[PDB]
Design a protein around this nucleic acid. Sequence first.
RNA 1: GCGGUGGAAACUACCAAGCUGGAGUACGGUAGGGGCAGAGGGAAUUUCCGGUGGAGCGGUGAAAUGCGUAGAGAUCGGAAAGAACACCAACGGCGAAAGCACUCUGCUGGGCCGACACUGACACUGAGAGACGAAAGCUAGGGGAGCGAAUGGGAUUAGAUACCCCAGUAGUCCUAGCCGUAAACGAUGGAUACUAGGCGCUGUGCGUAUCGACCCGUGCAGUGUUGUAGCUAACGCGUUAAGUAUCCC
Lengths: 111, 62, 84, 64, 134
Amino acid sequence: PEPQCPPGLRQYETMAVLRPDMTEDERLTLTQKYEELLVAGGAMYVEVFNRGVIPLAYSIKRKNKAGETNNYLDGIYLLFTYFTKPESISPLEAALVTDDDVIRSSSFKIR
Amino acid sequence: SVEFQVFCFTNKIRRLTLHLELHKKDYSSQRGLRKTLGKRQRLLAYLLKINGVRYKELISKL
Amino acid sequence: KPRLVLKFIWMEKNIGLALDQTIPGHGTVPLSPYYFWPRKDAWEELKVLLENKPWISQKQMIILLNQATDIINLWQQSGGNLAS
Amino acid sequence: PIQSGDRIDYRNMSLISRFISEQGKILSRRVNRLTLKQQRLITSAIKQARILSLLPFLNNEKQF
Amino acid sequence: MGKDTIADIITCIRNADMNRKGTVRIVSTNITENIVKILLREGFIENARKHQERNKYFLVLTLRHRRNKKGPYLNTFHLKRVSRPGLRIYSNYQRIPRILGGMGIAILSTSRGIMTDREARLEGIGGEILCYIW
RNA sequence: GCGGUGGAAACUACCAAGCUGGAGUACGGUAGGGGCAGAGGGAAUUUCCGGUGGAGCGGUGAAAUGCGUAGAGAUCGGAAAGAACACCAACGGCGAAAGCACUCUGCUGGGCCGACACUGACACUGAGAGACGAAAGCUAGGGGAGCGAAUGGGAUUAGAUACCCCAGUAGUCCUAGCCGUAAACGAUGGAUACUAGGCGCUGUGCGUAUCGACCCGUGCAGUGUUGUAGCUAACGCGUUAAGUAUCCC
């Protein structure tokens, strides 16, 4: 079902880990910035599914906007099996670095 | 098909050149541009060796 | 996947640890490797051989390593004392 | 063995962690007994999962 | 298919029998056909056969031997080029050499066809010496 | 030798016309530390800031200079900094060479394989030329933790401008250039054709086997190790020749 659209442009999958605290505006507001990606990308944007929060190995260094406070052991594991033009992925990187509830966001390009 | 080789290499040099001039330091693709120029140039000396008028058309097309 | 035997020998100076290993889903022939009288490592040599196999499951490697460890341990104590 | 059809990704933490040690370091091709292609692909995937802190960079030593 | 089509056949002959293999596969152009035609009839080789593989007509050529020896052919064949591409050689009907007195032959390109020393010495014609074997 | 003239057309050349295996292209795959740019990463080291505790720490062939009661080192936490990227790493992959390995993205080179899908010799080499070209060096500006020419002190020493040790500047890194040399080494210019094998590795292709990963043979290309023939003064090289030949510098 996914090989329908990739005549024309590319395919990706972004892994992004989250804060473990909030349960509200986490599925919501990060899907709203996924709608910011929808203004950017506008392709078969499906399967943005969530993975359960588990203890990771080692993480420090949240870098809140002038917080620089929280160490972590847990995080919500979002991954977006999205699909876009190869133009404007670096603004997705800046969007997934600058926002607070998204730390350590590594995108990929499955083949 | 020869004029698709010359025309295809011409679009190759267009897209690779507008890559390279806004980039300016890739010293690997410089060989690709120069192999394309030399390869196309031996094609143009080939079709000039065969014909007059037809190679004049290849000059006048681009 | 067949299952396994470490054989130890204690003589006062010298341990030998001997690892006899077995087949995965791929038909293989191990020896028993005997690790030797000089101070050259027995556990590292044995465990590394097992890891190099992957043909050995974790349970199998560990059970043999635990038995090997136990003998090296008894050997160290007997050598430091005179048990015999 | 254990190729299992589906390709090795960072999301597949079953065959991954059969390949690292408990000390958390990548084992070679002659130990893991794969092809060169399997080895490089789990290498890049394991280092990706190393970025996502799914896997430790160092495991603290233990006895008893 | 390199630069030369005659060092093609010839170097396949030397490289053929210096490894004692009594079988040659070469291309069959016009001048190769003429050389093996004026070479089977002079007792050096045994048979030349044309066939096809992908409708490309080739020559398989059977070399001479003798019986079970240290090497099954006694007289080493000793083929040699002369008129290299880039250094053409040309002879009158005077210069045309009797190779080793006559034990070798000098296949050469007359205006008639390509002859040997017998068939170009009686003619009185001369021409471009392709190669001489001995 | 040169010239005139009459004949021959195989070879070089010429004229014309086809041909495809040479060479390319189109297409589908495919592998990659190929290059450059942008983001991101964590160990470790050093320094600083705190809590502890109190006499050495560090170093060596043995010592010493140094640092330390102004609290060193050690230990735990907090920052910051630059530089390099452990295991994977393989007698492995790629690049024309130099080189290239933390990961991810973008642009982009090059290779390999198949079908005839196309053109029809477009080929090879290359004087002079042009590009790139480890490291050290230099101009300009940043940056500077570690290491460290010069230098300085201690030691060994008859002596020590040296090996050892403690500090340590240029440099190392980056931006933009210049320089254009190296054991820039495979001590082997490039290209094509042909000439035993064994044991390997990498990439793809076919058939077997299952119907799916294997696994066997293979078609090629590349990489390695023993080795026939032949060559070689010998050592050795040996389908990736230093073999047999042809061309070019």
